[PDB]
Design an enzyme around this catalytic site. Structure first.
Site, short mmCIF file in Angstrom:
data_model
loop_
_atom_site.label_atom_id
_atom_site.label_comp_id
_atom_site.label_asym_id
_atom_site.label_seq_id
_atom_site.Cartn_x
_atom_site.Cartn_y
_atom_site.Cartn_z
N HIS A 78 0.80 -1.28 -0.28
CA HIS A 78 -0.03 -0.42 0.15
C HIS A 78 0.76 1.17 -0.15
O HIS A 78 0.66 1.77 -0.80
CB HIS A 78 -1.21 0.11 1.01
CG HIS A 78 -1.93 -1.31 1.08
ND1 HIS A 78 -2.70 -1.93 2.07
CD2 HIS A 78 -1.88 -2.33 0.09
CE1 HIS A 78 -3.39 -2.60 1.81
NE2 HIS A 78 -2.77 -3.58 1.00
N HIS A 235 -9.22 -1.77 -5.18
CA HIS A 235 -7.95 -2.08 -4.19
C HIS A 235 -6.97 -3.15 -4.76
O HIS A 235 -5.97 -3.18 -4.27
CB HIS A 235 -8.28 -2.86 -2.57
CG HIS A 235 -7.41 -3.04 -1.78
ND1 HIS A 235 -7.00 -1.79 -1.34
CD2 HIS A 235 -6.45 -4.27 -1.89
CE1 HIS A 235 -6.09 -2.07 -0.47
NE2 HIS A 235 -5.55 -4.25 -1.20
N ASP A 239 -2.80 -2.47 -4.47
CA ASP A 239 -2.21 -4.04 -4.84
C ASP A 239 -1.05 -4.09 -6.07
O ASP A 239 0.15 -3.74 -5.91
CB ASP A 239 -2.58 -5.32 -4.46
CG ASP A 239 -3.04 -4.95 -2.89
OD1 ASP A 239 -3.29 -4.20 -1.84
OD2 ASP A 239 -4.08 -5.72 -2.84
N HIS A 262 -0.12 -11.40 -5.07
CA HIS A 262 1.54 -11.00 -5.04
C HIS A 262 2.38 -11.96 -5.40
O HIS A 262 3.00 -11.65 -5.86
CB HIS A 262 1.74 -11.00 -3.36
C1 LIG Z 1 -9.99 -12.78 0.03
C2 LIG Z 1 -8.14 -13.02 0.18
C3 LIG Z 1 -7.43 -14.72 0.16
C4 LIG Z 1 -7.79 -11.77 -1.32
O1 LIG Z 1 -7.11 -11.89 -2.05
N1 LIG Z 1 -7.44 -10.54 -0.22
C5 LIG Z 1 -6.82 -9.71 -1.94
C6 LIG Z 1 -6.53 -8.87 -1.39
N2 LIG Z 1 -5.01 -8.71 -0.53
C7 LIG Z 1 -4.78 -7.38 -0.16
O2 LIG Z 1 -5.50 -6.68 0.08
C8 LIG Z 1 -3.16 -7.76 0.32
C9 LIG Z 1 -2.91 -8.57 1.25
C10 LIG Z 1 -3.43 -7.84 2.86
F1 LIG Z 1 -4.26 -7.43 3.20
C11 LIG Z 1 -2.63 -6.21 2.09
N3 LIG Z 1 -2.50 -6.46 0.50
C12 LIG Z 1 -7.61 -8.53 0.48
C13 LIG Z 1 -8.09 -9.86 0.43
C14 LIG Z 1 -6.71 -10.21 1.96
O3 LIG Z 1 -5.80 -11.07 1.40
N4 LIG Z 1 -7.28 -9.46 2.96
C15 LIG Z 1 -6.38 -9.68 4.35
C16 LIG Z 1 -7.28 -9.51 5.52
C17 LIG Z 1 -7.24 -10.00 6.37
C18 LIG Z 1 -8.23 -10.19 7.24
C19 LIG Z 1 -8.41 -9.11 7.57
C20 LIG Z 1 -9.62 -8.58 8.80
C21 LIG Z 1 -10.11 -8.39 9.68
C22 LIG Z 1 -10.27 -7.91 10.99
C23 LIG Z 1 -10.38 -9.35 12.31
C24 LIG Z 1 -11.32 -8.77 13.28
C25 LIG Z 1 -12.33 -7.95 13.08
C26 LIG Z 1 -13.15 -7.27 14.25
N5 LIG Z 1 -14.26 -8.18 14.69
C27 LIG Z 1 -14.23 -9.35 14.91
C28 LIG Z 1 -14.92 -10.44 15.07
O4 LIG Z 1 -16.17 -9.97 13.75
C29 LIG Z 1 -16.24 -8.73 13.75
C30 LIG Z 1 -15.05 -7.72 13.47
C31 LIG Z 1 -12.17 -7.09 12.18
C32 LIG Z 1 -11.59 -7.23 11.36
C33 LIG Z 1 -8.57 -7.89 6.40
C34 LIG Z 1 -7.68 -8.11 5.38
ZN LIG Z 2 -3.63 -4.21 0.01
#
Ligand SMILES: CC(C)C(=O)N1C[C@H](NC(=O)[C@@H]2C[C@H](F)CN2)C[C@@H]1C(=O)NCc1ccc(C#Cc2ccc(CN3CCOCC3)cc2)cc1
Ligand SMILES: [Zn+2]
Length: 297
Positions: A78, A235, A239, A262
């Site tokens: 990012h 997004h 990335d 990635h």
């Molecule tokens: C579906 C996933 C496997 C995918 O393909 N992605 C492509 C995108 N990748 C990116 O954007 C990259 C990789 C990093 F994310 C940053 N750059 C997006 C996403 C990802 O990796 N997303 C990662 C990710 C995983 C988890 C979370 C979260 C969270 C979270 C946890 C707890 C809470 C609090 N409470 C928990 C109980 O229920 C209510 C909420 C809130 C949020 C964010 C990003």
């Molecule tokens: Zn990202």
């Protein structure tokens, strides 16, 4: 000539690592001509410096990680997207912990901090990597391609079998698109059903509705919803621009991503860098005849 750019003033930010949940102090500093973007773990003695270059990428499962021996800098994409979007060639990025702060999940806060600090044009021609031949990598159903193009444009397609998943394809061409207005504010996203498992693997420990689009069974949980109708694929474009910047210079060409991430992005950069028939380094002694242009600094 199109000149190299650095920071006019230092940027300071305090945040939390998305995956680690660690509190982290970030400092961006000006750097000399042809330094590129260099990350520095300042919590270590001695300090460990890792150039933001494809050769230094390790893990790519959870995010883009830079590695030198057993030292890592996690989640660079990012911030690198912000630097590439604003045309920053040279900067030192000091961090007090392994992971770049997640901020609001987008490049928006980094872009705002950098544009507040201001940029400084340097007395050296900006170098661009120009795509000369098509380079494509596949693995299973996923594909990442570089195509020759007189400019800079990025295409992305995702395909999630999920009720919430809206426009799942987008194209940006920076001859019309504003990085700042149309890409930079697009936030990362995670599925609620995955979080328990992720936390058991020491991932998403810093995740919250404040730094990510959280997707339930049927809806976005975030009370204020999406910034863009196509925020998820926007997004992936954010990335991709960050990962492309691991080439160490701005691109003159087209990137097309088909369910890429990635890891395939890194296989594509490695394949391009190795195929010296497929690219060259170019400068523009006259901005008026160049196929790209950058905001005033
Ligand atoms: C579906 C996933 C496997 C995918 O393909 N992605 C492509 C995108 N990748 C990116 O954007 C990259 C990789 C990093 F994310 C940053 N750059 C997006 C996403 C990802 O990796 N997303 C990662 C990710 C995983 C988890 C979370 C979260 C969270 C979270 C946890 C707890 C809470 C609090 N409470 C928990 C109980 O229920 C209510 C909420 C809130 C949020 C964010 C990003
Ligand atoms: Zn990202």
């Amino acid at each position: 000539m199109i000149k190299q750019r650095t920071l006019k003033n230092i940027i300071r930010a305090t945040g939390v690592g998305l995956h680690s949940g660690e509190k982290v102090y970030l400092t961006l500093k000006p750097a000399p001509v042809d330094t590129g973007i260099v990350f520095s773990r300042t919590d270590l003695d001695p300090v460990v410096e890792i150039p933001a270059r494809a050769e230094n990428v390790g893990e790519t499962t959870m995010s883009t990680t830079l590695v030198k021996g057993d030292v890592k800098v996690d989640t660079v994409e990012h911030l690198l997207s912000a630097m590439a979007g604003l045309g920053i060639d040279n900067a030192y990025v000091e961090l007090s912990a392994s992971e770049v702060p997640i901020m609001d999940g987008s490049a928006g806060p980094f872009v705002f901090l950098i544009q507040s600090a201001g940029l400084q044009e340097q007395e050296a021609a900006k170098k661009f990597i120009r795509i000369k031949r098509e380079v494509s990598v596949e693995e299973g159903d996923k594909r990442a391609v570089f195509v020759p193009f007189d400019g800079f444009k990025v295409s992305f397609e995702i395909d999630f079998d999920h009720p919430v998943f809206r426009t799942q394809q987008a194209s940006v061409d920076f001859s019309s698109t504003s990085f700042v207005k149309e890409v930079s504010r697009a936030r990362t996203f995670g599925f609620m059903r995955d979080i328990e498992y992720l936390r058991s693997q020491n991932l998403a420990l810093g995740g919250s509705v404040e730094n990510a689009i959280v997707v339930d069974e049927n809806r976005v949980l975030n009370e204020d919803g999406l910034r863009y109708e196509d925020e998820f694929v926007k997004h992936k474009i954010l990335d991709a621009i960050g990962d492309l910047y691991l080439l160490g210079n701005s691109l003159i060409g087209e990137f097309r991503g088909f369910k890429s991430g990635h890891a395939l992005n890194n296989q594509l950069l490695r394949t391009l860098i190795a195929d010296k028939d497929a690219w060259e380094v170019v400068t523009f002694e006259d901005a008026r005849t160049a196929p790209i242009s950058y905001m005033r600094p």
